[PDB]
Design a protein around this ligand. Sequence first.
Ligand SMILES: *[C@@H]1O[C@H](CO)[C@@H](O[C@@H]2O[C@H](CO)[C@@H](O)[C@H](O)[C@H]2NC(C)=O)[C@H](O)[C@H]1NC(C)=O
Ligand SMILES: *[C@@H]1O[C@H](CO)[C@@H](O)[C@H](O)[C@H]1NC(C)=O
Ligand SMILES: *[C@@H]1O[C@H](CO)[C@@H](O)[C@H](O)[C@H]1NC(C)=O
Lengths: 170, 214, 217
Amino acid sequence: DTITLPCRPAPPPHCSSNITGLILTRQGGYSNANTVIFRPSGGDWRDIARCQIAGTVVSTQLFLNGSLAEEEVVIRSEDWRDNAKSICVQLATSVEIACTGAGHCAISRAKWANTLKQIASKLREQYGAKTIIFKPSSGGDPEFVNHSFNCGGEFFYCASTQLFASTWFA
Amino acid sequence: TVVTQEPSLTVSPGGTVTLTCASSTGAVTSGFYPSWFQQKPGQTPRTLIYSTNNKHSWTPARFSGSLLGGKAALTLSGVQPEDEADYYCLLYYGGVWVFGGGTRLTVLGQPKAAPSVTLFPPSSEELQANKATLVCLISDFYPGAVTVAWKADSSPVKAGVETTTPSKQSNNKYAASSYLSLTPEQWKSHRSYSCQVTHEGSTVEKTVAPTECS
Amino acid sequence: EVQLVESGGGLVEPGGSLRLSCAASGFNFSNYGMNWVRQAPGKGLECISYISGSSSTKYYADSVKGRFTISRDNAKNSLYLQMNSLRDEDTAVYYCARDHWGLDYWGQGTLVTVSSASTKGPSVFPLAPSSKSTSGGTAALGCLVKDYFPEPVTVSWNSGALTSGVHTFPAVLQSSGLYSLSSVVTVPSSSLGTQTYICNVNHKPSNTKVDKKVEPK
Ligand SMILES: *[C@@H]1O[C@H](CO)[C@@H](O[C@@H]2O[C@H](CO)[C@@H](O)[C@H](O)[C@H]2NC(C)=O)[C@H](O)[C@H]1NC(C)=O
Ligand SMILES: *[C@@H]1O[C@H](CO)[C@@H](O)[C@H](O)[C@H]1NC(C)=O
Ligand SMILES: *[C@@H]1O[C@H](CO)[C@@H](O)[C@H](O)[C@H]1NC(C)=O
């Protein structure tokens, strides 16, 4: 059972990659009782650059083939109390995203759910809440509202909405 | 903060050359987001490699970015003669782009070629404006080293001569231009003017005359 | 298609001011940072300045700090470089480059010449094809662009339709301080009387457009 991210154009099979991390943005509200909302960061490439874990692969929202963390998932941010400051989440165990060439790539829903749970646990330890809600990207250009990546000299765009739509409790 | 490249490198056609790009601030990692630009003579720099090794759609397959020993590396494997250009390396220092010195890459396999000369006499409009200029144009020669001598009738001329330094054309070969400044009086006051272009010991001469109208 | 077009440039007296503009098309201009990168004649590339998409972050090179000011109007798709206190070291071709994982798209570049000299438009005289330049049915004909300043001039043929044979030669720095170049083309001599050849010279630094026709004889 897998999550299917639809991609345009169809990514060839040799573009299958390893999600080693991602970049998030917390939705405005600070203390909304106990539910904190995060979304995939759709800002500037320099945010991904300031994360400094993305590796050599050009990618938005999700870091492909980047550097993984040593022991456990680690979240970082210039300022936790600021929403404009992005959240660089470095995974500990990569999640393989496999592309078939049929216009969509696939991610194991069990592995992605475990990754989301670990991310939510670390975000809960940081922001001191309980409920973590991953919501989709709140608009922008095609390169940052979608998960985009350059492979084989071609830029591919994949709707990552089904990766960021879940609730995680304590 | 200095981004250092080899000043020049030379490679035969079909061979393999590796350009290196070193940073004074430590070793070059994937976070320096290296880019490699190719600038042919007089052209706008053109991105070949970005983010260590990503290619654009217009990047030839023979170019490849990489990282060796804390240096960025652009590898051109299977060099073609049109790959002769200047390759600038661009490094990223937390929001600050810094270019490299550049590398002049010479594809050492250009066959020697004799210069093509064309000499134009002063036009009607220039002569009527009390000026005269003979234009001796040289093209399609390699190596790019010529010498130009001017002749009034048959004796050498030394005053009023202005010659370019040769500049590579779009065919890797060189081209130059030579101008002889005269007054229209001394243009018609002599029977012919001759341009002698000496290249690799061989001289090609062209000649025009004032009485040769139409 | 991503397009970046520079305007401004030309001749500026030392100590004077200038403003380079860069019009962008083919992309959401507000969604990308911009860079000014200059190149001195015969020298390497130098990244001068960077402005963020929201014009919130501006980086300047040490050489141009305090003198240059980068700006942008997103509603007008325009990037601006206000150059003040210009020195002889600022004479260069100035390129406008988009900031997308690097400098992926550049402008055509605009030449800024810092000289106390004066602007002077070209004088175009046709180099007619005669029985001198007819070798094997091929006639060589051109136009001389004499005495002009500053650089450069763009020379096309037949409104920019001749493509083949057009070789425009570099200019000389004459003793007078003015430039001059030649632009020739070899065509079939069997087309001299049936095809009209209009050498179109354009000197943007002096706003001099001149379409001089080259007639045989
Ligand atoms: C092009 O860029 C503009 C920036 O001016 C984007 O405009 C967005 O408009 C929505 C309308 O509700 C605002 O809420 C956003 O804040 C604006 N800025 C963004 C998303 O950065 C516009 O969406 C962009 N469009 C594309 C296709 O790239
Ligand atoms: C991804 O990582 C796996 C191990 O989890 C490894 O087998 C594989 O080579 C990597 N490859 C791709 C294409 O992502
Ligand atoms: C990621 O790395 C694997 C090797 O592990 C490679 O096959 C794949 O193409 C890479 N994906 C990119 C560069 O997008």
